[PDB]
Design a protein around this ligand. Sequence first.
Ligand SMILES: [Zn+2]
Ligand SMILES: [Zn+2]
Ligand SMILES: [Zn+2]
Lengths: 198, 285, 62, 113, 96, 366, 34, 94
Amino acid sequence: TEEELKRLYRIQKTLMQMLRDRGYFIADSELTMTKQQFIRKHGDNMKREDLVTLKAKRNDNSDQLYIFFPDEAKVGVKTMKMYTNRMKSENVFRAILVVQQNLTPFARTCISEISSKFHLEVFQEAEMLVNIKEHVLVPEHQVLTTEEKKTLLERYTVKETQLPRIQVTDPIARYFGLKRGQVVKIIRPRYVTYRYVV
Amino acid sequence: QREQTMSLYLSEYLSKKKHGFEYGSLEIKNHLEKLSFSEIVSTSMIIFSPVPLSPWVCHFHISEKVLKRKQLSAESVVSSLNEQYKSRNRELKLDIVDLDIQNTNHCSSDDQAMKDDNVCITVTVVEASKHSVLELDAIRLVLIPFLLDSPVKGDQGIKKVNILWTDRPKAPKRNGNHLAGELYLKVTMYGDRGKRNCWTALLETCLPIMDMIDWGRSHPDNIRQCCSVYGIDAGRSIFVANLESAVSDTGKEILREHLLLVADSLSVTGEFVALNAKGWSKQRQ
Amino acid sequence: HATPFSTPGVTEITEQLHRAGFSRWGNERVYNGRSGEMMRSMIFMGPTFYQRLVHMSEDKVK
Amino acid sequence: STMKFCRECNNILYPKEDKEQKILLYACRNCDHQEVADNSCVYRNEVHHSVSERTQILTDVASDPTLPRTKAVRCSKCQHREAVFFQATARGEEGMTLFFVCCNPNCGHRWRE
Amino acid sequence: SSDLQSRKNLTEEISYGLREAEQVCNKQQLMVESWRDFLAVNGEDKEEDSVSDLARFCYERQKSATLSELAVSAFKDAYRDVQALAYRYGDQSNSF
Amino acid sequence: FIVRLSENEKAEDYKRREKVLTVYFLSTEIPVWLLFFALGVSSDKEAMDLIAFDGDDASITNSLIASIHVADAVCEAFRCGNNALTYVEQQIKSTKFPPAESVDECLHLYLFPGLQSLKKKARFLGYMVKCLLNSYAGKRKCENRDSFRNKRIELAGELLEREIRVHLAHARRKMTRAMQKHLSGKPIEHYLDASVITNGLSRAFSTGAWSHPFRKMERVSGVVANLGRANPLQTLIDLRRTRQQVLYTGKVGDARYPHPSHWGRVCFLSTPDGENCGLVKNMSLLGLVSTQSLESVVEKLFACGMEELMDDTCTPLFGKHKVLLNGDWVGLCADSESFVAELKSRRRQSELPREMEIKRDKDDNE
Amino acid sequence: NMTYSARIKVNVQVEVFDILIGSIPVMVKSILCK
Amino acid sequence: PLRGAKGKTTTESYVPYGVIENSFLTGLNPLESFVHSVTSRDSSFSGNADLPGTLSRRLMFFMRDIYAAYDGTVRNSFGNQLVQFTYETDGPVE
DNA sequence: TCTACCGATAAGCACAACTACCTCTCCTAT
RNA sequence: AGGAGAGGUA
DNA sequence: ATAGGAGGTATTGTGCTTATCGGTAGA
Ligand SMILES: [Zn+2]
Ligand SMILES: [Zn+2]
Ligand SMILES: [Zn+2]
């Protein structure tokens, strides 16, 4: 049981670090929370429910992301329908789902069908054990906005398709929550480069 | 690839203790090495002893010297066998509803007394009020191979771990570059099943020793799947390092810009395509 | 005799060459044919057996 | 992994268990003869790893791993950094203690932790 | 060599160097997990066994690949010194 | 005659898939124990005594027990009566092209023709199974294709023989077709075509395509080459060469490297460089190729002290070494050293053919 | 530019109720050579 | 070991390892000559020379379209795809 | 409880197994 | 004139 | 237009495209 508790503590710490990197106004107390303090605040049992929380963007309070932890593994269509109904009721456009096992193909099709209305991100528990961003091999990644993307396109007089491509399934894109059509800035240890998400 | 070579680096807090790196590396190797039960047991025999218990009780007599060398105990190996039996239980398609293992220092076996300091492990099969397991061929051909293939230490995924010394690691440390020559571990994992990633299984097996292993520099040695774990840039950097190593081994001198251009050309679509026709066709598509 | 597995020793060859009135190492003092001066270093000379191959110059001209 | 021939017809015997008899017995299908068993042993095999016969020489199975080498430790008799370290028990002590063996061909010195 | 005596001395030195290199390779072959008890600092009565078994070391080396690699590495390391004797036994006028 | 040790896949469930001994005789897949008991054997103990493994291995015993169980399951009450003979006859008759001879006659001519007795061939089969078990256990080394001890070379007595045989067969087919076409509706000279064989030989010598030793089609190449008249040395070395046929040129194996069996037979220091590197080997100066001996050696062997093979399978062998002549068990000898010494003494007195090899090995005890 | 071969003669008898078959090339200095 | 196996189970494969005390000037022993021939049998067969040619051909097919543009960027000939925004040379002439 | 695709295990099918080269011999049914 | 097969060079 | 039985044997090696083979998930 204690192994599961420390696993969940590591997952929560990595999730908070990723949210802080993405800029969702994460409090310093959560980032600097120790294992002993987390266990003391945990109580007797977590039941994968206390990890559910809602976070809003630092720049704009209108945008918010809800983190959902299913009670049991191998979720089905009913659980996804309940989650999307809850999102519609709460009026949230983004959500992060952390699951223990791979999703049902029917659940994946349901997520893809409703991807236009709301954006859903799925992360495995094993993938969140180690923070990908905090690595020596991974260089600094900076997400460019629409104005900066337009300035970059106009400066080199190039099209969006005539840029180096990065797949959505890459861990960095999912870590930064990058959608299709967004460019990034990479600084190597100096010469810089840009990658187009496709 | 089936070998799927890995690379693990020790943490920086082990240097405070005297000879901390060597002890940590040896502990990691001991904990993360697959040791089959057959390598410890010497003589396996089935003795007719006569939920009700079934006949044909199997005996596994193990010398104490092997356990002392491997730093194990009879209780520990019995617990590991029970845990692995209750972990999968996919094989053994017969009446093995219950399987209990008992440990006895001395057994009532008068067949041979060559070794006096050997501990005997008793495995008893339980049948659900049926005689379907009364035959000897079935147990001898199914249960005996199953127990010998059960690893008492490590994980089934990890094949072998060796300790190596290097001076130019693929992932340099941020600070403290004055340390000329570090020590790291190389892990090889089986690729029998492609359903689960080798790195994913490796992360789960290192939960008790997460602090010891420095995950800030550890990275798979492969190039194709490293982009799916640490991004395209990390794979490109490792590819550049491997290309430089190959050029150095070839004995020729090649400028950096050529290798960088090769790396950027082979990873322009976000993935390292092969040099065959299929890779070029996919890149053009 | 020059049997491949019964070759005479180097000492025997040197003694045989010394008894002939030449240097035991097979090198003899020579003089440059262009200026007449004596070379500082002796040049090894010996009647080896050579062969002529069937590949010619005009056979490769294209 | 044991077999014997009954004296009546000189044919192989297969082991069997009888609930009423509660004793190991051997009888053959060739003739009708039941004989009492000895030592109550029906299988006895020494565990060996000789499965890949005539294949361990070509492909290196790494049956005996090589001891690790380190360069951080400095030898005493000579100023050589390369050394071999391993864990082994003492003559009468308990636990595993770290040992060191110098890699200098001209030194041949070994010391404990 | 300058004369016959120098040639004989060089031949004897080469023979002794090859013997020393072979001994070094035999010593290096023991760096395996099977000889951890012998390599430890304790009391072992099988010291003469590892020395008298001279014809078995080559057979063991020819069967394993890691042992062969260790042996060839040790042989090169011990044979660099043997190769270094040419500068001592060679004159400055040698064309080679 | 092939004896194969492999996992059973016929009438075997998932629980029982252990290795068993099978016999591939005339493509029948007969169990080994049924064949053993068909050749005048009526006891399991006698069959085990014939296969003198002389070792303690669990795998061998398990394989033997599995083979016995498979034989028992395949045929019921095979030990009693002659049910094994009926089963093997049915298996032979089940083939696509069964032999015309009956079961009582097929076992005498198509099964070990060297041994006339029906019980001696059972002992030979037991010896073969013993050798297979010893090789499986690792006590006996397996044969290698690189060594010259297990290889033979043919220059003209066999290379041309198969071409002559196939051309004669084609000529006979044409002649009988013409005879059938002409009988229904002539000198014998017109019946036989005298040009078919000559044209075939001319084509073989010109194109260089020679008949494959084991395939009717897929003619091999490189058998016949041209001489070189640049110098007498070239035409002398062209006449003295040895060629080994390999399936593919890119990879061969260990044949490209020299072998200790080349000592004094072929030149290991000289070999062509290129695709056929090591495949073409030049013969040594003192190299001779043995020819078939018209004299009978069996008669002279009994005079030296050789004892004939025992017909009865019940009598075992205590220490008598096996005597094999051209792969045929001819007899037995009490002491091998004295026997081989006497044979060598007789050979040195011109009482035996000068081209004969006498091999004595204490490991194989033969 | 012809073939150095020798003819083959063997008697063939037919029954109801030396002919030429082929030429084999002859190696120089063989058992049958001038 | 040269006579098949040393009989210490029977081996099937070996890794040759020999030391030759004699030199070319002194004269090679027949067994030493055989060992030298076995060792030098390598490079006599030229069948692996296709690997560099095939690798060079494939790499050239992949990298032929790469050229430098007037804007200072590195672009591919197919669709003017941007490979490198700026050349990563460590000087000294641009 | 019966549909409904959905990843694994064998079974074939298709290229790839090097340049610049230079000679000779043999080939085209019946 | 085009092919098939062998021995060969850098 | 006709002709060219039948034999146990003795290239790999990577991608690609099936089929089939169970196999759970949803109503
Ligand atoms: Zn016991
Ligand atoms: Zn009986
Ligand atoms: Zn030292």
